[PDB]
């Protein structure tokens, strides 16, 4: 029996008509909205410096005219800034195609979609959660940076992400478009500390609301386990502490099964489940929101 | 360490702009391309004829102006004919934005993408693989049959999915744009035969291959079978038969590893993998093509 859940993005169309190429010197992409075009600021970086770049002396070092951007059109740039670890670039033209838009920072354990490019050209499209550790399991080869995270609500995009480097285990992380980085993380080629990662305990609870909802509920007792009890163990185990939010409260409304009775669940599980199935796996997923949930398999939007 | 592989899913904005909504008589999803838009034929039914439709008699009954079509602009029809289970309905406009295009039927393991829309609004993107018995594990609700599946060649998408139902077990199924549906499958709300599915032998293999590429080697051992010896285990086994392709040919190029030393891996995995994980998984994965491997890992497209 399957659950009725993919991996599910958002349509890209309307990010796609934002994304351009740069190249300084390398060859990213940059994402275009009204007169600025936003790229990673390691374009400026010579290859031989990529481990130890100044930026603030490249940033100096460029004119206007340093900078070309390609739409698949040439944009001429006007102005140019640094934000962190973003460049941001002002353009003659206004993009004709931006969406309405904001800025926003996704938070562990939420989701968010992916428009991933190569050469100002959109190539695929993926969903990835943030990971406690502030890294992604993405999909990202050489030239795909500049690349974008983003979600939407309504009609307006919140860019969230774009995309900066791959780390030593294979993960992935980038800037939000204050120009911070994601985590403790920075934008040089060398080895850094990495965070542990944990189970994103939110969302292994929607996963097993998604078993239920697929009359698969072998795992639920009448056992019960607290939310100030769960957090203690949490700590222990490597999963995150738990944090209901209406979007959880909707499934435990439509199950009749109580938040707090998943939370034992979940611990128990934990130690093994001794050979049973949930949902065509023997470990916890915990890469499901709630509203994944709620939207894939109850259409509540 | 992570894989690197996501569900990579065609950027959706070429198709985006050919979805329209369909009306005669509930509310479905209609695909426009130059001057014609293709729906399924059960949106002439009503909703109490749902389980034995006479599609026939239904065809005999409407006329043009019967069918309402809406792209969020209203499009004329002014030719109406059934082929399969499609209607293929002539409008006045050519879609303007008709990309280049073919149709072309998908064969079991196979990857597409798909537009999962609703009242001719997309809403959401994911990837599938067609499954042994013409099923997919899709994520599909009320009012999204229209939507579409396709795959991309270059500029080029080639259509092979127009969704009509979901079964009993929660998978998916649908027409080619030949109008037949996939499997044995029939286009009537009725309970019907499902064939087994089984595990994705070529898939499998590549999956192997993407652990390999990423330093997980410990399933690999000097022990071979044959192409001709597995496909006779593979039919007891529910299996696949395997037939290698120069995707494949490339990963054990790549990695310096026989295809038969992995037919021999996945018999004896397929026994248990004796608490030991491959990618993070504890059993055979057969989501992932050798092309996806090849693309997302190695980048040769
Ligand atoms: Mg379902
Ligand atoms: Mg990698």
Chains 1, 2 share one sequence.
Not at 195 to 217: E, F, P, Q, R
Not at 264 to 288: C, H, N, P, R, V
Request: hydrophobic fraction near 40%.
């Amino acid at each position: 029996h399957h659950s009725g859940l993919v991996k599910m993005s958002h349509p890209s169309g309307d990010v796609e008509a934002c994304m351009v190429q740069v190249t300084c010197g390398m060859t990213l992409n940059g994402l275009w909205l009204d007169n600025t075009v936003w790229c990673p600021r390691h374009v400026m970086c010579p290859a031989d410096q990529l481990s130890d770049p100044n930026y603030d002396a490249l940033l100096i070092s460029m004119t206007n005219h340093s900078f070309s951007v390609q739409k698949h059109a040439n944009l001429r740039v006007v102005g140019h800034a640094m934000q962190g670890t973003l460049l941001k670039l002002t353009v003659d033209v206004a993009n004709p195609s931006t969406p309405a838009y904001t800025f926003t920072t996704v938070k562990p354990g939420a989701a968010f979609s992916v428009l991933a490019c190569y050469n100002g050209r959109p190539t695929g499209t993926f969903t990835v959660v943030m990971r406690p550790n502030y890294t992604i399991k993405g999909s990202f080869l050489c030239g795909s940076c500049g690349s974008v995270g983003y979600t939407k609500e309504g009609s307006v995009i919140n860019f969230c992400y774009m995309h900066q480097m791959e780390l030593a285990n294979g993960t992935h992380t980038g800037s939000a478009f204050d120009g911070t980085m994601y985590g403790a993380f920075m934008d040089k080629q060398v080895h850094q500390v990495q965070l542990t990662d944990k189970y994103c305990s939110v969302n292994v609870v929607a996963w097993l609301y998604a078993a239920i909802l697929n009359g698969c509920a072998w795992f639920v007792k009448p056992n019960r386990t607290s939310v100030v009890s769960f957090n203690e163990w949490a700590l222990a185990n490597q999963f995150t502490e738990f944090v209901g939010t209406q979007s959880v409260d909707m499934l435990a409304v439509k199950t009749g099964v109580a938040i707090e009775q998943l939370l034992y669940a979940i611990q128990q599980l934990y130690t093994g489940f001794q050979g049973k199935q949930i949902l065509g796996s023997t470990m916890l997923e915990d890469e499901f929101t709630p509203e994944d949930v709620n939207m894939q398999i109850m259409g509540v939007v």
